[PDB]
Design a protein around this ligand. Sequence first.
Ligand SMILES: NS(=O)(=O)c1ccc(-c2cn(-c3cccc4ccccc34)nn2)s1
Ligand SMILES: [Zn+2]
Length: 251
Amino acid sequence: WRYGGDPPWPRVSPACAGRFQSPVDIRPQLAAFSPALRPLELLGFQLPPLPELRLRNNGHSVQLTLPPGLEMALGPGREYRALQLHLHWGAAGRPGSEHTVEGHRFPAEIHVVHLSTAFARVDEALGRPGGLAVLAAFLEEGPEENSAYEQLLSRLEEIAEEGSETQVPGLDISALLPSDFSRYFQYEGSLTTPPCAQGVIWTVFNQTVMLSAKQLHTLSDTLWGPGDSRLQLNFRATQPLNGRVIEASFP
Ligand SMILES: NS(=O)(=O)c1ccc(-c2cn(-c3cccc4ccccc34)nn2)s1
Ligand SMILES: [Zn+2]
């Protein structure tokens, strides 16, 4: 499968034609305030430098493989383990976040993908309710170089070619996320690429993460994808809520 052309995704996976897909346009007036949504909790995200982690240009994103022992809870009894994180982005003067807010597309987006502790493997969790959970944050332009992001972004030249990878020292993985874990939207949807399985719990932070202009340019102008093409605009069009109500942890 690829962005911007064939094969049609429903042909690759029928779940890509499900009614309840991601990403979506968050319209926060239509979000439902839900006070049972408590602050997200993360354990083990502050990693030592060794052992190193694998960072891969997979042709459709840059993906960092996370080690065992990263625990995430969406709430009491809602427990997950982190598997990997990756990015979606646009191109020169074109934003490429997956989620939008009142139609606004942000420069880029981070996803940290998690497996429910009830499942040993992703393929057993696929399509099961709450089997997979993704934390999502928008990346915007700020004045300073983001030091946590610089650790990944400084290595993209090494993985410019589709299918290449490199090793990077462990870092504080939670430093790639906003510090505000209290304010977020949450809805049930799908993986945003094939196999587009449903049952995925999406949590989208209110607060954004700040990268420098240079960093955002590095992300969008360094990697190459399928064929002789730049890896850019690697986001799926927003999908209709189709009756789903997005919850918000705030009024
Ligand atoms: N953009 S996204 O976060 O929604 C996303 C899209 C696809 C993802 C994905 C695929 N994964 C898989 C990993 C390992 C084995 C798998 C086996 C079957 C299907 C997906 C698998 N895990 N996340 S995460
Ligand atoms: Zn993603």
